[PDB]
């Protein structure tokens, strides 16, 4: 529910640092629970520059459209095209096949302010 090794955001997203320095981003187990079954996702353009807090993707459930926010500032270097065909991966694999996009972070101070597994568990605890 909260993989030990990921970093987390307050908008209920995780970030996994990759070998090449980029970050894979998705929504957490908590977030997908609250969304319910996903039926479409609208992904950003590869190459888009975002600021932390920009609404840059949309998860659509049977009930509602729900905005997904950039957790850090940077450039979108990849998006998860499997989601066009299998959007339910966001629900069944929110830390695995349900990843949403990958980002080249442009600001180290944002990265240093993201929650570790423990500090995320405590944001739920609340």
């Amino acid at each position: 529910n909260v993989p030990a090794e990921l970093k987390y955001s307050k908008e209920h997203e995780w970030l996994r640092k990759e070998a090449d320095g980029t970050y894979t981003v998705g929504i957490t187990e908590h977030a997908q629970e609250l969304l319910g079954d996903m039926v479409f996702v609208d992904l950003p353009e590869v190459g888009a520059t975002v600021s932390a807090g920009d609404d840059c993707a949309v998860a659509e459930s049977v009930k509602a459209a729900s905005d997904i926010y950039a957790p850090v500032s940077g450039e979108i270097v990849a998006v998860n095209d499997a989601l066009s065909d299998s959007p339910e991966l966001v629900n069944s694999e929110p830390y695995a096949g349900g990843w949403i996009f990958k980002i080249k972070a442009s600001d180290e101070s944002e990265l240093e302010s993201l929650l570790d597994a423990t500090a995320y568990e405590a944001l739920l605890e609340d």
Binding site: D37, V62, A65
Partner: protein, 363 residues
């Protein structure tokens, strides 16, 4: 908010509870999509204990109902037969859509929705009085709907021998009391199944037995997707007191013949039908996206002239794999329309107001 006798059973089954018209009810139990698939392909069940069951008794029951309702209960000639009918005001607007069962000449039963309970009970007791009807509100009963191609066989695993005998080969739209179970071949999904009403104190254990019989718990999310695919109306959305049944695809439930049966609203409805009305149609959006309630529906006629209707209910259809909607529209619409979804004009196909029959897409 109030809760049914099943509230604890729903929590043990993993319900996500929401407030629904002052009732805590399961929105789903994990996956509304999977829940919809269970009803389409096997068996799913829904707590419908927030519906109100009204028993009516007395020698003028039939006569009363022939005046109260816009369908004609004189069509119920076999014991336990049910029909769907609107119940209209004097202006011909819809007060509710309800089901009614005939048991004997002097005993009928109505089932009414949760959201319209108090308005319907006042309208019924106001109008029944001069007919001398004994009216019983059965809040002592809960009710479970079990729906899908394996629903009747799974539920019938819980029946005793007399109960199985009572429902053997029962056709759609019948209900029969068999011990403490009232078993009816009705539903809100497009599928076969039962709605089973039983005493409140028996309902938790019956739900438990149905789970164990392989019937999946299904919540409000799937109840909406299933009913909407099946082209079934939701009061407040497809109709309300301002809307004629003729403009909510309820024309088929108006029993115009015999002409000499007056019923509340019939005069106004005859006048409406002569002036013509708007009509409820289906919309299918095959492009990516989801149709939502109250969106404008626009089309341009043969002459260059624009007309506008409105979505009454939209959703994503898991059986179709496309969004669908029911929409009330001017007469004159052709085969396609446009619906405005957040600043963009999405084309849609206009179809009959039903999308799935027998687990199969109807196009």
């Amino acid at each position: 908010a109030q809760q049914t006798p099943l509230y604890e059973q729903h929590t043990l089954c993993g319900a996500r509870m929401v407030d629904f018209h002052g009732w805590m009810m399961p929105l789903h139990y994990g996956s509304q999509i999977d829940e919809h698939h269970a009803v389409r392909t096997d068996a799913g069940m829904f707590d419908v204990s927030h519906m109100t069951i009204v028993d009516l008794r007395g020698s003028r029951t039939r006569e009363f109902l022939r005046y109260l309702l816009a369908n004609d209960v004189a069509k119920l000639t076999k014991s336990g037969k049910a029909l769907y009918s609107g119940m209209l005001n004097a202006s011909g607007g819809v007060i509710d859509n309800l089901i009614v069962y005939y048991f004997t000449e002097d005993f009928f039963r109505l089932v009414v929705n949760s959201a319209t309970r108090e308005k319907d009970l006042s309208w019924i007791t106001q109008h029944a009085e001069p007919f001398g009807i004994e009216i019983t509100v059965r809040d002592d009963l809960s009710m479970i709907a079990v729906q899908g191609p394996n629903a009747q066989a799974k539920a019938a695993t819980l029946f005793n021998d007399a109960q199985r005998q009572a429902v053997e080969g029962m056709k759609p739209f019948f209900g029969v009391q068999a011990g403490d179970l009232f078993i009816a071949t009705t539903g809100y999904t497009g599928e076969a199944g039962y709605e089973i009403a039983l005493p409140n104190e028996k309902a938790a254990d019956f739900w438990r037995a149905l789970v164990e019989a392989g019937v999946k718990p299904c919540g409000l999310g799937a109840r909406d997707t299933l009913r909407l695919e099946a082209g079934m109306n939701l009061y407040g959305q497809e109709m309300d007191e301002t809307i004629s049944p003729l403009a909510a695809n309820m024309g088929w439930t108006i029993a115009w013949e015999p002409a000499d049966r007056d019923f509340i609203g019939r005069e106004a409805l005859e006048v409406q039908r002569e002036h013509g009305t708007e009509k409820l149609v289906g919309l299918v959006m095959t492009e990516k996206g989801v149709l939502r309630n109250e969106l404008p529906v626009r089309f341009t006629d043969a002459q260059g002239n624009q007309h506008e209707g409105i979505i009454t209910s939209g959703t994503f259809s898991p059986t179709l794999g496309y969004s669908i909607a029911l929409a009330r529209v001017p007469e004159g619409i052709g085969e396609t329309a446009i619906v405005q979804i957040r600043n963009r004009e999405m084309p849609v196909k206009v179809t009959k107001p039903v999308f799935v029959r027998n687990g199969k897409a109807v196009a």
